[PDB]
Structure formats: structure tokens, C-alpha cells
Design a protein around this ligand. Structure first.
Ligand SMILES: [Mg+2]
Lengths: 47, 306, 377, 223, 54, 204, 127, 128
């Protein structure tokens, strides 16, 4: 195969899109407990 | 219509020159050319006075400038042109009417039955022939209708009121690129492909194979100018072809490798940039040729680059 | 049998769902045809036409060469041992195969992935579909060997636009795939690296409609335009310098131009013309300027007449001379029986185009089953 | 040719009703009050009319020349707090003696209505089976569906069909004439029907071998 | 502005264009022609969709 | 070559950047793996695009009915304009925005409907069975592929690198790409231009 | 059903035997068949460039450097690391020691940074 | 030889069902190469190449999706020239498609050629 291997010898065409980079930043041990995160979700996030 | 008139004339000028060269063998080519000019004037006069139908109906009385046998030859030659034209058109119509889909499904049923070989070919040709016959009856009726409508309209509106050819027209896959913006797009695509080092070397086919087989057999001190001009006449090298020869000669012979680059140091088709100067000074700093380093610096500073 | 095992390996057959492909497998002589190869291909193509269970057929070459032409060294040795029947049987078989390809009743597809010379284009270029790769090279160096562009090459070269057929046949100028598809010889173009895609997309079509086959080939093909260095851009020079009657007008007008305004293209055309045998040039020019107005069978008939005259040594030994000096001695300096071109008159070039069937010998005329095939090309 | 125009007039009435319904639904958003209520009632009446028209396009059709046979009628029961709820299921097959075969299964409350429902749906799942010279299969075939293993063998032209009730009825309706068969394992009738349809479709014809391998497949007596 | 433009173009250069392979930028082929090259059919007198900015 | 320019237009649309961990049936379209992505081959994207566009255009001579299904809010207007141009006066905005939510809207297209309230608006089924279904569902919110496979209808849809085998095997015309806004516009533009060019050949 | 084959072949086999009526889409599917592509051995090759090791440190070198994507540019204008790697590939291309090539690329990158800075200073001067 | 022969044949079938393109077999044998040559002649594999056959062999085979099952017998089975057809009618599952490959004094043949040559031997296996 020819053309894609040509165009790899060009500018930076392997750039992550905004959605994928935003999910990477969304992801970046264990978690908060249920009785703690439920208290946070009971106080806040009602807006 | 322009095609068949031009092809009638093109066949006619081919055959009547050979008939005149024998009818009047003492006549030289200039008198033949004059007679051909007069005959081609009067045959198009014949077809404007009465069309192609009069040319195949009955021989008329000739003019006084030529004898009767010359007009007899003109008649026979025109008829043998007419038969050739009609035969070529009949064969090209049978060509598509063989593979028209109705005949295709008839032959498909025949092959599923078991009729195979010469009988299948014979029946296919008969069915194509019947398709051609029905098409020609339909076109006869269509032309009669068209002519009657034209003459009816003409009577009503009268009663109501008071050699050389050459051209390229690019067409690929049934798509026309005949506009000059397409050749401009092609130019601006090919130059960028050249620029980005994405062009490929030409295949080394035929005589050029033994030339590089000789270039890998070149000796120390041999002047490669004659073989280099021979190769530049054969394969018309660009920058990519040049560097491909350079890179294959790097494995072919190292002393012949050092000869060629030196020889080329100034060619525009090589597109000598700064990288070639740097590689050629570093390889001779490696190979310990200080005078050759001075020579390449001289031919570098000659072009105003310091 | 047990005697045919070499020819079975020389012409390999590949089977697909509804198609059969003949593959030329001669790496020693670069796919140069022989009489067994042409006879086997004729039998295979006749059976594939006769079979209703096969929808289209294909022709491929293996290696870096599609077909370099025919075997002339075997004909040279056969002439040197005295007889001519082997050459006669070879020529009639090859021209019959070309006629069958030109009047073939099914789609035929010819792949060109390399060099093509001589009858290697005559066996393919009358086909219904021609696919050219980037490595494809098409050339006609018969005038350097002393022969004429036989095997129907006087048909598709004569039907090129302009005087390009005269230019290519006389000068032996090579062509590219883009130039072939510009001239109209090649129907489709595709790269070398993308060949396995197209060669199996065609492999698993279960259709017989030429529109479907053409659209599949176009969809899997490539999009190209000729460059500024293409031959067709100089078609006005081709018309201006190759449009006269005799070869002497052409060479003298070109010499006058190259002397006056020093155009390098006329110099390279001079170098191309001067190598060839001077008897063959008039034969080839008369052949193209006659076969522009004749059909495929008539072109094959007078090509066979020229061939059977030129292998009998009626007036010259240019054929054997060029073959021996370009294949056997390899000195690259052959000496022709007319050492110049002006001494060649109308008599000996009429002796090439002569109706030798009038000499009461039917075996000197090519036979063709024209009533049974009912030809249409 | 009256079927086509009978469908066409229903199509035109449906298109007109759709346009009127769209026109009223466009105005319901901006209309408030008793005018909105009367538009709601008019829309409901139009919906009733369009439901009545679209019910009429459901005319089931059978095909002439086809034969339909009953393979199985069972009485199945469901337990509720008031007793046993008993229903009926029927399994039916159909075929035209020329290679087309189909089957259906249906459940109703009565033994006649179960057969009627399966008779309606018998023509919607139809397969085509390839035969060799219109009397036998191309080669022997063995296949299994769950625990029902089925073997079929071809036979010469004056042998006859050697099969049980379900397999014999299915092959007779498909159009076979000289086949020997054997059912090994469980002999559930519904699984037997499914295993027969698996075997009859797993058979490779000589044309299929020809297409798969690109060679020529020749009968041996034509050699 | 003449003094502004040349000095605004020295935050550019050492390869002002770059994009060694940007065929649309280097050439001038239009989106109608590109859509004509796709699908292998001529598109004259053919009104398709409004522009994406619209 | 012009082909290298067409391919970079496809690359400019952003349709060559898939997601990680492609399935087994997608490595025949894939090219490599870089920066946590599967790179789709633009050559095969173009070939699949040409096949799909040719089929959609070739339906016009046979006078077929094409059904569009879109489940993404990002491509509302492009699919709306494409469906308005192709389907013509027989276009229903309520149906084209709400009917794909109903389960069994094709296998049961003759079931009765009832008017209740403002609701999500009332829409019946199609009177005529469609001949082709063009899908823009990547989150697989609707059962349209399953119903079309049950009812033997060709499906033109754009396939992700993480498509299941069960959904993939029922798709007749796969177009391997990432459905960005530019590529969705380009796809719909090719479809609309091909269909109207076919329509003009019959004088309409 | 229990037939084998894909949509076109199954439908063709069904309509040949007079089981079903011919659907409308059959002719369009025959005129434009679906695409096919050859077998792939299930293996995806990780695409790599020769400039990759020089790109690596380039985030340590000139520490963090340019970013031309948040600054949504185009997928053709190189990104600092790419131009630095191209220079050192063609630099080292000519023999030149590896570390010396890194030094002479580092010096020209920093001279470019000074040139950019004085361009911004003259921007503020004519602002 | 029987263990490695059945090993390579089951590798071939297992990789056919996954829709792959090439397989690699190691260890190899001359009997295995001749068996693969018979498969190539009958059109069940496209090509096969043998690498380093006298020190450490490896065989690369290219597949196309045409073979259903390959077996190699794990026991001794004699056959005469006049028992070949009756044995073939009971060995192949379909009794029509498939070839039984036996080894003979004349070489490693299939069952149709050995009838013509009138020579029997040991049954190696079959493919269909
Ligand atoms: Mg039991």
C-alpha cells in the first residue's frame, strides 16, 4: 500500500482529536466510598 | 456527418492518387496533385449538387476537362468507398447488437438447455441480425416521419405568411478533463510531488541496464563523460533518477561513485542544494582529500554560497 | 500426456469463480512466445470461449516482463538449416491467435505489469480491457532488427491520432502507462502496489456485463494526467515533421531543421532513424499509410504476405543480418543489403506487398475462418 | 390486474390522510383551548380512519399449486391460581414439489385456529433446495441439530424413498424421489424439521464446487 | 502597514509555507472539482448541498 | 496524481483516525496503530465510498425508496437537507426525527397508533417498504440494523473500529471511517449529487 | 432463514428458483456490488518513524516546546519536534556525529527563539 | 511423523477457520512437503515455501479459504491397488469430494493417481 505511507512523511497528521484528548484528560487508586460520594451528590449536583 | 465526409475524402485521396499514377504514368507528382485537386473539387461539387445518393445511383455524363474513362474510374472508386463505409458501419452495429441483453438472455436460456458451440454462435448471430433489422425498420419510419413533419411545417408557414489532424482531448473512465484548468491542476500537482521528494525513479529497461552494468565496471581514472551523456540521452534523468543512479553506484563502485558527483557538480536537473555540498565535503574529510575539499569549496563559492 | 510437461509449466492457468487467467511463465527468454506457447494459448482461449460457465478471461505475465515479443533466434536457426515451414507455421499461428483475440466473444482483460515489445502488444491491445501499471513500457523496435510491426500492430498504431503511429513505429520510441491511456491504447491504469486489490476484485465478479466490469475497474483504478514532458504535447511537431509522402522528404526536412534552429528533438529523432535498416522503413510507412484504411483481417493478411516475403530472402537479408548482429554477434553494427535508402525503389517494396497468392500457391496466403467467426473489429 | 389498483387507491387515501394529519398536528402547538380540543377530536377521528385503512392492507395470500401438511399438534398447559390454562400449538410444512419448501409454527387456543394461523404464516419462510437430475441429492450428507442426528444418502433411479414420517413428508414436498435416510438420537419432530432443513442446505452441488475451486466438474459417465 | 506586514511575516519563514504535501493549499482545485473526481461523474448544472459554513 | 489529492481531502476531513483496540473484522480496513488510535486506510475508505455512492445513485433509475436514520444530534441539518432533497415531497419531519425510537417500526409497520397528548408527537409507519436504509448510528441506540436484516433490506452505514460482529455482519455496504462533521457532510454531498445527477438523466 | 451466503447471493439463489418475487434493489446491487479486500493475517503493524528517538528527548530538549494543535492549525504544518527530527535526520544524514548534530540543531532552535522574541519586541515597538 | 503431520494439518484447519492469510509450520518433514504439494495441485492451498530443509525446517503456507478438514491417520493402514475405491467410499465424509493420500513405491500419490498406476501402500491421510 502506497499513499498513506507517503503521507506519513509530511506534517503531523497523527494528532488526537478533541474528544479523545478530552477523554484522556477525563481519566487523568480505588475510589471514594459510596457513603462519601453519595453525601457529595446529595449536597451538590442538585443544580 | 463531419467524420464520414472527412473519411470519404481521406480514403478517396488515397485511392485516386494510385489510380492517377497508373492512368497517366508519365504525369509527375505535381501534375497528379493538380489533377487530384480538380477531381476532389468536382466530387464535392457532385455531392453538393446531389448528395451521396446520386453517387450510387447511375453514372452521369462527364465534364469536358476529363475524358470518359476518368469519370468511369471516379464512379468505380466512389462505389468501392461506399461499400467499405457501409460494411464498417454494419459490423460495428452488429458488434453491440450481439451483446444487447435480450440476445444475452436468449443465449443464457440456450446454454442452460444444452445448446453449445457452433449452434450457439449461429443462433446468437441470427438473433443479433433480427435486432439490427428491427432497428433499421424503426429508423426508416423515424426518418420518414421527420421529413414529413419538416415539409408539412414548411408548406404551412409558406401558406400563412404572404489531410491534417492532431489534438489531445483527455478522457479517463468516461470523464472529460479537456479544460485547461485540468492541465494547470496537473502541473501544480506534479511540481509539489517533485518538491516533497515523493517522485519515483524510472524503470531501467532495455539498453539502459547494460549502461549501469558498465558504470559498475568503470575504472579508476576513466572519464565517464561519454557514458554519462549516453545515459542522459537514454533515460532523461531528473533529480530523483540522478540520486537513484548515485545510490546504486554507491554499491556498484566507490571510485566511479566519487567520479560521477564531481562530474555533475553544476547541473540544474540535479537541483544541487546545500545538503549535497555538506555531504561531499564530509565524505572527503573522511577520505582525506584536502585538495578535493578545496575544489568542492571553490565550486560552492562560485555560486555565491559561502 | 507425459510429453507436454514443459509447456504446461510455460503457460500456467489460474482458475477463479467464473474466470480463467492465462499466465506466461518464461523467465529465461523474458516471456518470448514460441509456437507451442501460441498453440496452447489458442486451445485454451477457444475452449474458454466455447464454455458457457466462464464469464470473462484474463492474460497476465509473471516477473518484471509481460512479453518481450516472439522467438526470432529459433526462426533464424530454422532458416539457416534451410527450411521455412517452421517460420510459416509460427507466423500463421500467431496471426490466427491475434484474429481470435480481435473477434473474441467474451470480455478479455490484459494486465500489463512490465515491458511489452513486438507481438506482446499485438496479443493484448485488440482486447476489450487493457490495464497498465506504472512500470509498463510499450515500444516497437522492429525496424532496428529489420522486421515490420506485424501481428496487427499496423492496426492500432495506424488508428492513433495524428501521425503518432508513424512516429512511434519509425523511431521505436517507448511509451508509459499514462501516455498509453492518453493515446487510448490502455483502458485503465493502476499502480504496482495496488495490484492485489484489483486482481481479486475482478477475480470474484460473477457478472458478464461490460458496463459492470468497466465500472469495477474504474472504481479500483487510479487517476492520472500526463506531465509536461509527455510525448503527446509534441503532436504538432509530429504532424509537421512526419506528414510528408516519402521517408527522404522526412529525413531531409528534419536535417534542415536540426541544422538551422538546432532543435535537440530532431537530433534524437535522427539518431533513432539512422540505426534502422533502410529497406524496412518504406515497408513500414506504406504499411501504416495503407492500414489506416483497412480492417483487422486485411491488415493481418498483408502483414503475413510481407512476413512470408521477408523470411524467404526474396530481395534482402536484413532480417537474418539484424538478428545475428543484435542477438548472436551483439556487435551493435549491422550492415544492410541496401547500405543506403535512396537506391531502394518502388520495385522491391512492391515485392514485399505483392499478391503472391497469384503465384498459384494457397499456402502463401493466411487463412482465416471469417465466415464462421463473422468478424466485427 | 385489479389487485394493483386496489392497492393503489388505498395508497392514495393513506397519503391524503397523512397530509391532513400533518396539517392539523402543525397547528396543535399554537392552538390553545376549546379550539385545541376540537382539533384533538378531529385528529383522533382521522387516526381511527387511518388505522381502519391500514388494517385492510393485511390480506394474507397463499400460492396455487403448493401443498400444505400438518406435522405436529400438541396440547400445552400453563398453571395459574384458578386452574390450568390450556392452549394448542401446530407445526406445518409446505412445498411445491419443485424445490421450494417452508415451515411454520403457531399457537392458538383451539386446534383449528392453531392450524389456521400456521397456514397463514407457512408462506413467509421459504427456502430453495437444489436437486440432482430432479430425483436425488448430490451426495451423502450428515448433520445434527441439538441431539437429532440425521443421515441422508442418494440412490439410483429405481430405488424409492426410505424415510420416516416427518423426513419423508418434508422430502416429498421438496421434490426428491430416490433418497435413503436415518434419524439417530432424539426424535423430536420440531428438531427433525430443523435438522432436515439444515442437511438439505448444507449439500454442495457440482456447480458450487466448480465456483469454489475454479475447475471443471464432470459427470463420470460423460467421460 | 508596509512596515507591519513584512515584520509580521518574520514570525513566519524558515519555511514560511511548510506543508510539504498540502495539495489544496499549493494548487487551486475547488471542492466541486474534488467531489467531481470522487464518484467518477461529471457535475455541471448540479446543485447539491449548501456550504458547511452556511 | 489526482488520486493523491483526493486521498488527502479524505485525510483533511479527519476520517482516518479511529479508536483503540479494533476488532478482528476491522483489521482488513486498518493500517496501523499510533498514539493510541487505529489508523484506517483512506484507500479502502474511498473504495467503499465509491461503491456505496454508486449503489445509492443506481437506485434512482429503478425508482427505489431510501430511508434515512440519524441518531446523532450533531448531524441533524445535513441529514435533514439530504432527506429533503432525495425523498422529495414525500418527506415527514416528525417521522424522520421520531420513528426510529419505536421498536419494531419496520417488522410491525402496520400496527395501530393512538393519540394521547402533546407527547413526542404522533407518527405512523411508512406506507411503502423502503429499499435501502442509510444509518448514522454509532452508539447503536436503535434496532434498525437488526430489523433490516430480519426483513432483507440493504443497509449503508459507517462502521467504527469497535463495531460488534453481530451488527457488522448484517451491514451490506460498510464505509470504514470516523464520522466527523466534515466526513458526514462529504458523504451526504456525494450521495445527493449522485442522486440528482441520476434524476436529471430522465428529464426530471 | 436457513439459506447460506450473503445478501446478494442468497437473494439471487432465492429468485432463481421462483421462491420469491424479484426485489427492486437486486438490479442496483448487481450493477454495484459491495467491496472486497484480501486477507490480512489479523496483524496490525505499529507505524514508526526514524525520527522517533530524536522526537523523544525533544520534549526534554528545549524542554516542553511548541504546540501547534490546541492552536488548531492543520495536519500538514509540522510541529517543532517534527522539524527538529527532520533536520537531524538529514543532518546526521551527512555523517556528522550524532551529539554534534544535536548541538547544532539546538543552537539554531535557540537562535530561532531569539528571532521570534525580537519579532514580538518589534511588534510591541510598532504597536 | 504422524504426530507432527496431524499437528501441522490441525494448525492449518484451525487457522483457516479464523480467516488468516499465512501459517508457519515447525517441525517439518519431506512427507509433509509432499502432502502439501498434493494439496496445492488439487487447489486447496495457493502456495507453500520450505525454508532451511536440512538443518531446522520451517514451512510457510498461504491460504485462500477452501479446505474444510485435514486428517492424518495415527495408526498403520495397509491398502492394495484394488481396495482404494472401496476404502475411499467409506473414508471421506461426503463420499464424493476429497482425496485420500497414500504412500507408494512410486512415491507419495493421491488415490486417483494410484489407481491408474496400480500400486498400493500405507494410507497417510485425507483432505476434503
Ligand atoms: Mg432416546
Amino acid at each position: 500500500m502506497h499513499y498513506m505511507g507517503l503521507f506519513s512523511k509530511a506534517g503531523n497528521i497523527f494528532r488526537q482529536p478533541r474528544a479523545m484528548q478530552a477523554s484522556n484528560a477525563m481519566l487523568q487508586s480505588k475510589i471514594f466510598v459510596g457513603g462519601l460520594s453519595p453525601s457529595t451528590d446529595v449536597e451538590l449536583l442538585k443544580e | 456527418e463531419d467524420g464520414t465526409t472527412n473519411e470519404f475524402l481521406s480514403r478517396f485521396v488515397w485511392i485516386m492518387r494510385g489510380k492517377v499514377s497508373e492512368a497517366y504514368p508519365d504525369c509527375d507528382k505535381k501534375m497528379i496533385d493538380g489533377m487530384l485537386l480538380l477531381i476532389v473539387e468536382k466530387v464535392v461539387e457532385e455531392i453538393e449538387r446531389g448528395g451521396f445518393n446520386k453517387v450510387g445511383s447511375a453514372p452521369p455524363s462527364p465534364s469536358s476537362e476529363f475524358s470518359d474513362d476518368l469519370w468511369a474510374t471516379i464512379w468505380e472508386v466512389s462505389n468501392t468507398v461506399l461499400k467499405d463505409m457501409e460494411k464498417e458501419r454494419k459490423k460495428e452495429k452488429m458488434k453491440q447488437y450481439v451483446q444487447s441483453p435480450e440476445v444475452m438472455e436468449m443465449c443464457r436460456f440456450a446454454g442452460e438447455i444444452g445448446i453449445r458451440g457452433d449452434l450457439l454462435r449461429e443462433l446468437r448471430f441470427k438473433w443479433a441480425r433480427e435486432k439490427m433489422d428491427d432497428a433499421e425498420f424503426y429508423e426508416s419510419l423515424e426518418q420518414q416521419r421527420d421529413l414529413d413533419n419538416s415539409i408539412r411545417e414548411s408548406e404551412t408557414v409558406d401558406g400563412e405568411v404572404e489531410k491534417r489532424k492532431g489534438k489531445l482531448k483527455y478522457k479517463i473512465y468516461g470523464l472529460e478533463l479537456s479544460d485547461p484548468k485540468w492541465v494547470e491542476m496537473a502541473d501544480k500537482i506534479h511540481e509539489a510531488e517533485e518538491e516533497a521528494d515523493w517522485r519515483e525513479p524510472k524503470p531501467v529497461t532495455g539498453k539502459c541496464k547494460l549502461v549501469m552494468e558498465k558504470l559498475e565496471s568503470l575504472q579508476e581514472g576513466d572519464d565517464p563523460s561519454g557514458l554519462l551523456a549516453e545515459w542522459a540521452e537514454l533515460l532523461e534523468p531528473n533529480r530523483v533518477d540522478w540520486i537513484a543512479l548515485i545510490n546504486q553506484l554507491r554499491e556498484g563502485n566507490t571510485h566511479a561513485y566519487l567520479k560521477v558527483a564531481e562530474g555533475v557538480l553544476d547541473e540544474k536537473s540535479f537541483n544541487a542544494s546545500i545538503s549535497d555540498y555538506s555531504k561531499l565535503i564530509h565524505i572527503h574529510a573522511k577520505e582525506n582529500h584536502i585538495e578535493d575539499v578545496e575544489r568542492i569549496l571553490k565550486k560552492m563559492s562560485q555560486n555565491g554560497i559561502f | 500426456s507425459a510429453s507436454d510437461a514443459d509447456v504446461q509449466d510455460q503457460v500456467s492457468v489460474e482458475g477463479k469463480a467464473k474466470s480463467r487467467a492465462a499466465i506466461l511463465d518464461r523467465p529465461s527468454s523474458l516471456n518470448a512466445l514460441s509456437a507451442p506457447m501460441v498453440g496452447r494459448l489458442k486451445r485454451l482461449y477457444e475452449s474458454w470461449e466455447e464454455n458457457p460457465a466462464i464469464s470473462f478471461v484474463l492474460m497476465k505475465g509473471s516477473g518484471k516482463t509481460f512479453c518481450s515479443g516472439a522467438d526470432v533466434l529459433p526462426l533464424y536457426h530454422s532458416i539457416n538449416e534451410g527450411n521455412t515451414e517452421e517460420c510459416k507455421h509460427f507466423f500463421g499461428s500467431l496471426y490466427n491467435f491475434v484474429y481470435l483475440q480481435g473477434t473474441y466473444l467474451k470480455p478479455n482483460i490484459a494486465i500489463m505489469d512490465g515491458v511489452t515489445m513486438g507481438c506482446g502488444g499485438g496479443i493484448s491491445i485488440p482486447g476489450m480491457f487493457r490495464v497498465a501499471t506504472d512500470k509498463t513500457v510499450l515500444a516497437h523496435p522492429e525496424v532496428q532488427i529489420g522486421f515490420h510491426p506485424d501481428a496487427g500492430a499496423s492496426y492500432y498504431l495506424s488508428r492513433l491520432p495524428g501521425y503518432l503511429g508513424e512516429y512511434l513505429a519509425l523511431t521505436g520510441q517507448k511509451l508509459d502507462g499514462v501516455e498509453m491511456i492518453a493515446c487510448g491504447l490502455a483502458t485503465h491504469f493502476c499502480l504496482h502496489s495496488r495490484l492485489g486489490m484489483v486482481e481479486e476484485r475482478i477475480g470474484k465478479l460473477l457478472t458478464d456485463d461490460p458496463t459492470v466490469i468497466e465500472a469495477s475497474l474504474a472504481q479500483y483504478s487510479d487517476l492520472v494526467y500526463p506531465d509536461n514532458t509527455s510525448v503527446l504535447h509534441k503532436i504538432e511537431m509530429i504532424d509537421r515533421y512526419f506528414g510528408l509522402d516519402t521517408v527522404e522528404e522526412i529525413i531531409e526536412a528534419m536535417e534542415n531543421e536540426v541544422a538551422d534552429s538546432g532543435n535537440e528533438w530532431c537530433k534524437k529523432t535522427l539518431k533513432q532513424v539512422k540505426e534502422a535498416s533502410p529497406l524496412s522503413l518504406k515497408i513500414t510507412l506504406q504499411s501504416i499509410r495503407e492500414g489506416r484504411f483497412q480492417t483487422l483481417d486485411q491488415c493481418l493478411t498483408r502483414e503475413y504476405r510481407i512476413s512470408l516475403c521477408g523470411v524467404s530472402k526474396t530481395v534482402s537479408g536484413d532480417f537474418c543480418e539484424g538478428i545475428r548482429a543484435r542477438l548472436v554477434d551483439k556487435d551493435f553494427a549491422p550492415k544492410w543489403d541496401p547500405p543506403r535508402l535512396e537506391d531502394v525503389s518502388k520495385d522491391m517494396v512492391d515485392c514485399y506487398f505483392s499478391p503472391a497468392t497469384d503465384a498459384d500457391d494457397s499456402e502463401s496466403e493466411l487463412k482465416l475462418p471469417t465466415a464462421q467467426r463473422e468478424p466485427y473489429f | 390486474d385489479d389487485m394493483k389498483e386496489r392497492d393503489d387507491i388505498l395508497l392514495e387515501k393513506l397519503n391524503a390522510i397523512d397530509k391532513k394529519l400533518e396539517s392539523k398536528l402543525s397547528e396543535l402547538d399554537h392552538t390553545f383551548g376549546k379550539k385545541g380540543k376540537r382539533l384533538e377530536e378531529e385528529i383522533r377521528d382521522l387516526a381511527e380512519e387511518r388505522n381502519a385503512l391500514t388494517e385492510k392492507k393485511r390480506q394474507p395470500l397463499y400460492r396455487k399449486g403448493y401443498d400444505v401438511h400438518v406435522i405436529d399438534v400438541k396440547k400445552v398447559a400453563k398453571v395459574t391460581k384458578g386452574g390450568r390454562v390450556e392452549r394448542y400449538t401446530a407445526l406445518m410444512v409446505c412445498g411445491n414439489y419443485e424445490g421450494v419448501i417452508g415451515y411454520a409454527k403457531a399457537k392458538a387456543e383451539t386446534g383449528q385456529s392453531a392450524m389456521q394461523k400456521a397456514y397463514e404464516k407457512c408462506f413467509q419462510n421459504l427456502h430453495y433446495i437444489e436437486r440432482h437430475e430432479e430425483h436425488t441429492i448430490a451426495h451423502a450428507i450428515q448433520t445434527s441439530y441439538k441431539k437429532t442426528k440425521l443421515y441422508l444418502w442418494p440412490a439410483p433411479t429405481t430405488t424409492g424413498m426410505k424415510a420416516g414420517r416427518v423426513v419423508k413428508t418434508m422430502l416429498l414436498l421438496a421434490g426428491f424421489k430416490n433418497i435413503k435416510s436415518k434419524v439417530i438420537g432424539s426424535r423430536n419432530s420440531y428438531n427433525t424439521v430443523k435438522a432436515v432443513l439444515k442437511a438439505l442446505n448444507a449439500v454442495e452441488t457440482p456447480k458450487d464446487v466448480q465456483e469454489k475451486f475454479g475447475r471443471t466438474v464432470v459427470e463420470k459417465y460423460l467421460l | 502597514l508596509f512596515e507591519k506586514e513584512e515584520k509580521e511575516l518574520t514570525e513566519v519563514i524558515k519555511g514560511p509555507d511548510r506543508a510539504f504535501g498540502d495539495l489544496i493549499a499549493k494548487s487551486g482545485i475547488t471542492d466541486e472539482m474534488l467531489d467531481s473526481l470522487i464518484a467518477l461523474k461529471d457535475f455541471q448544472g448540479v446543485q447539491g448541498l449548501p456550504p458547511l459554513t452556511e | 496524481t489526482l488520486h493523491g489529492a483526493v486521498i488527502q481531502k479524505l485525510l483533511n476531513t479527519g476520517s482516518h483516525l479511529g479508536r483503540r483496540a479494533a476488532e478482528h473484522h476491522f483489521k482488513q480496513y486498518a493500517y496501523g496503530t499510533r498514539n493510541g488510535m487505529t489508523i484506517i486506510d483512506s484507500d479502502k475508505t474511498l473504495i467503499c465510498l465509491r461503491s456505496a455512492a454508486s449503489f445509492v445513485a443506481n437506485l434512482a433509475s429503478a425508482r427505489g425508496n431510501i430511508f434515512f436514520v440519524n441518531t446523532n444530534p450533531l448531524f441533524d441539518e445535513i441529514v435533514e437537507l439530504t432527506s429533503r432533497r432525495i425523498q422529495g415531497d414525500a418527506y415527514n419531519h416528525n417521522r424522520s426525527t421520531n420513528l426510529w425510537k419505536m421498536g419494531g417500526f419496520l417488522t410491525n409497520s402496520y400496527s395501530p397508533k393512538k393519540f394521547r397528548s402533546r407527547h413526542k408527537k404522533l407518527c405512523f409507519g411508512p406506507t411503502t417498504m423502503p429499499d435501502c436504509v442509510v444509518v448514522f448510528d454509532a452508539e447503536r441506540k436503535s434496532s434498525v440494523v437488526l430489523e433490516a436484516a430480519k426483513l432483507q433490506i440493504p443497509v449503508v452505514a459507517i462502521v467504527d473500529p469497535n463495531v460488534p460482529l453481530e451488527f457488522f455482519e448484517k451491514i451490506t455496504y460498510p464505509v470504514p471511517a470516523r464520522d466527523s462533521v466534515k466526513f458526514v457532510y462529504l458523504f451526504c454531498n456525494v450521495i445527493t449529487k449522485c442522486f440528482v445527477a441520476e434524476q436529471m438523466k430522465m428529464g426530471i | 432463514s436457513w439459506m447460506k451466503g450473503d445478501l446478494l447471493s442468497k437473494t439471487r439463489r432465492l429468485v432463481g428458483g421462483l421462491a420469491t418475487r424479484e426485489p427492486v434493489w437486486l438490479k442496483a446491487m448487481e450493477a454495484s456490488p459491495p467491496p472486497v479486500f484480501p486477507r490480512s493475517n489479523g496483524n496490525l503493524k505499529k507505524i514508526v518513524l526514524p525520527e522517533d528517538p530524536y522526537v523523544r528527548r525533544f520534549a526534554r530538549k528545549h524542554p516542553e516546546a511548541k504546540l501547534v494543535e490546541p492552536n488548531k492549525v492543520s495536519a500538514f504544518i509540522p510541529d517543532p519536534a517534527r522539524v527538529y527530527g527532520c533536520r537531524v535526520l538529514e543532518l546526521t544524514k551527512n555523517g556528522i556525529s550524532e551529539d554534534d548534530a544535536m548541538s547544532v540543531a539546538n543552537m539554531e532552535y535557540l537562535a530561532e527563539r531569539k528571532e521570534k522574541k525580537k519579532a514580538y519586541k518589534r511588534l510591541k515597538e510598532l504597536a | 511423523g504422524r504426530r507432527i503431520l496431524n499437528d501441522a494439518l490441525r494448525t492449518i484447519v484451525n487457522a483457516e477457520r479464523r480467516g488468516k492469510a499465512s501459517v508457519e509450520l515447525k517441525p517439518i518433514s519431506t512427507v509433509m512437503s509432499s502432502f502439501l504439494r498434493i494439496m496445492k495441485e488439487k487447489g486447496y492451498i495457493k502456495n507453500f515455501q520450505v525454508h532451511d530443509p536440512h538443518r531446522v525446517g520451517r514451512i510457510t503456507v498461504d491460504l485462500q479459504g477452501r479446505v474444510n478438514d485435514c486428517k492424518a491417520l495415527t495408526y498403520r493402514q495397509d491398502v492394495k491397488a484394488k481396495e482404494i475405491e472401496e476404502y475411499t467410499e467409506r473414508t471421506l465424509p461426503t463420499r464424493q469430494w476429497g482425496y485420500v493420500v497414500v504412500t507408494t513405491p512410486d512415491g507419495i500419490l493421491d488415490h486417483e493417481e494410484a489407481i491408474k498406476r496400480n500400486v498400493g501402500g500405507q494410507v497417510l491421510g485425507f483432505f476434503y
